[PDB]
Amino acid sequence: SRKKMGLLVMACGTPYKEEDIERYYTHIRRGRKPEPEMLQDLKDRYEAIGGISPLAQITEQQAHNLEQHLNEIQDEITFKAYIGLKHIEPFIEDAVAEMHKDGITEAVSIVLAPHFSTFSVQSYNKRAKEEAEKLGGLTITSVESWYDEPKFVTYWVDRVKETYASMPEDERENAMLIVSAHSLPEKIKEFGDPYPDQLHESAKLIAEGAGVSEYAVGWQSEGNTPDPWLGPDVQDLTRDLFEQKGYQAFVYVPVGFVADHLEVLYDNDYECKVVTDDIGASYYRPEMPNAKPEFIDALATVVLKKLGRV
Ligand SMILES: *Cc1c(C)c(=O)n2c(=O)c(C)c(C)n12
Ligand SMILES: [Cl-]
Ligand SMILES: [Cl-]
């Protein structure tokens, strides 16, 4: 009756407990174990943002709710979700091997990052497809980007509108919206990587839908290699825009991220908040989509559009 398909949901991964910080960051650092002071600092950061455990549940909740919602809203396909992570188990290759073992022959994949880049999305999709080729008997159709799905734009538009509506009059008249994603090396431009263009278009679409005429695009969370990374960084951008025009409120939409993790709860809600507190501006950062129903319905529409079924 219903056609069976795998639903491969890919994400960065998180530690599952404090004793996973060493192995998770060693993998991010390409085999270089963090020094003891860095391990201690990371433990402190996770404690300050409320703990690791809640963060580690979000991708699983996203994948489970997406599977169930997709199976309810149409009658042709029965999806089974499999989670594949970049930096901790279950890895991408573990998920594809499990699909193969379970008898899946046809799958659709989606990365829980809305903008395509050559560093992340393309690498996830290539890893998944290479593992399927090695095992045989299984093919994967991969979503490449989805930042322009109207239901996803509307998620952020409605959160921005609520934040502006909640402001005092003086803030509402002297506010700045900063839309951001995770920085990458500038060298991606040598490949024509559309990641920067897609961030700028996300920003255009969200500001336009919310009616916000004053906005800026920034980057966050750059690494420390000697080569230049995409900027400006959100901390510098905030201070610069303040020094130019004296905004009384900054609103942060880190549209490249879809789930609470350190790079939002720390790199925005601590590091950007340090800057806004220092300059006397109010700080707002609306909620990440996490596994909320409005977001799950946007993802389900992305998948069904990719398969040509809506
Ligand atoms: C890979 C990744 C994403 C998407 C994210 O939000 N975070 C973090 O907060 C860390 C520490 C890492 C890695 N990631
Ligand atoms: Cl791809
Ligand atoms: Cl696509």
Ligand SMILES: [Cl-]
């Ligand atoms: Cl794309």
Ligand SMILES: [Cl-]
């Ligand atoms: Cl919100």
Ligand SMILES: [Cl-]
């Ligand atoms: Cl919702």
Ligand SMILES: [Mg+2]
């Ligand atoms: Mg313990």
Ligand SMILES: [Mg+2]
């Ligand atoms: Mg597209």
Ligand SMILES: [Mg+2]
């Ligand atoms: Mg940093």
Ligand code: NI
């Ligand atoms: Ni720009």
Ligand code: NI
């Ligand atoms: Ni990072």
